[PDB]
Ligand binder design. Structure first.
Ligand code: N6K
Length: 330
């Protein structure tokens, strides 16, 4: 152990996983090990907001490629409730850990990408944006089943309020941020997630992040270094003068061909990558088009790619977390 990890007698024999804190544990009712994360969010409003949003989303979603919540453990009263524990299916590894050690065959890349997009189709069908897709948020088991996790930054899509100024600060993981985040976008459209998936695909191809920016504007430097300078048409879509004039200030950069960056990659994988890593978010491929792409033809089956049945102050938010978790109480 490290601290109080107080999960009733249902869950026993705890092993540390990572870091609030995550442990595996034996579930004495279902007779399997499970993952459990301790969330002590109530002293920080940021952790509380992300806790409630995640719980609400994950309890509504039901999909093979999205991690569920199996159980939530907390004290019987608001006064006694200092922590919440979320119990989820235990997955042996994640794509971040796997890519640090293992070469993926083209077949593995294809199947992982299929499952990411299949999960994402469901999320987007519920009018939700994940907004922090990255290898460590893709859980894997030993048979290569994949589950999307961490909905702490997820939002309902809101394309009419997507516009913002140049260099607006952003929360989600830097290396997977679409170029428009740095230029004119709050990340309130589905195209933000597709860019992250493109980055993940590129990372699966070479085991290295494609755009490892070291700070905020360096991320755009990395993206433009491979895509090259945006076209006049793509620039004309950027009405914000600060962002536009920044881009016009840069020396001309040529496109680096994908087949030079990824000489061992399948050509169909690179055609799909090109379409996910499109600079102009309006021209970027959508999740259903991505699934229908020739690269995924061995798996594509829209009848087996389900969609969601419908669209989706700390003191009141501790109350809302209490209410939302009530169904798991004895
Ligand atoms: C979803 C990525 S984190 O939440 O950062 N990692 C913690 C978890 C959560 C659920 C798991 N199931 N198996 C392993 C897990 C790790």
């Amino acid at each position: 152990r490290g601290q109080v990890f107080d999960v009733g007698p249902r869950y026993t024999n705890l092993s540390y996983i990572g870091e609030g804190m995550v442990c595996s544990a034996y579930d004495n009712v279902n007779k399997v090990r499970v993952a459990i994360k301790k969330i002590s969010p109530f002293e920080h409003q940021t952790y509380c907001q992300r806790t409630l949003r995640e719980i609400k989303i994950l309890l509504r979603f039901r999909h093979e490629n999205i991690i569920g919540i199996n159980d939530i453990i907390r004290a019987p009263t608001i006064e006694q409730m200092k922590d919440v524990y979320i119990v989820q299916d235990l997955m042996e590894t994640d794509l971040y850990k796997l890519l640090k050690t293992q070469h993926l065959s083209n077949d593995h890349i294809c199947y992982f990408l299929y499952q990411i997009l299949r999960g994402l189709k469901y999320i987007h069908s519920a009018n939700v944006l994940h907004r922090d897709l990255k290898p460590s948020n893709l859980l894997l088991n030993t048979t290569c089943d994949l589950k999307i996790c961490d909905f702490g930054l997820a939002r309902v899509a809101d394309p009419d309020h997507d516009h913002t100024g140049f260099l607006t600060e952003y929360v989600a993981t830097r290396w997977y941020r679409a170029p428009e985040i740095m230029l004119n976008s709050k990340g309130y459209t589905k195209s933000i997630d597709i860019w992250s998936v493109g980055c993940i695909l590129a990372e699966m191809l070479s085991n290295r992040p494609i755009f490892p920016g070291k700070h905020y504007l360096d991320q755009l430097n990395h993206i433009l270094g491979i895509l090259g300078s945006p076209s006049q048409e793509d620039l004309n879509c950027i009405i914000n003068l600060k962002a536009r004039n920044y881009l016009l200030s840069l020396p001309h950069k040529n496109k680096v061909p994908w087949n030079r960056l990824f000489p061992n990659a399948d050509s169909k994988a690179l055609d799909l990558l090109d379409k996910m890593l499109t600079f102009n978010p309006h021209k970027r491929i959508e999740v259903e088009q991505a699934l229908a792409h020739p690269y995924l033809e061995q798996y594509y089956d829209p009848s087996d790619e389900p969609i969601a049945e419908a669209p989706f102050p700390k003191e009141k938010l501790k109350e809302l977390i209490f209410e939302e978790t009530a169904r798991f109480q004895p």
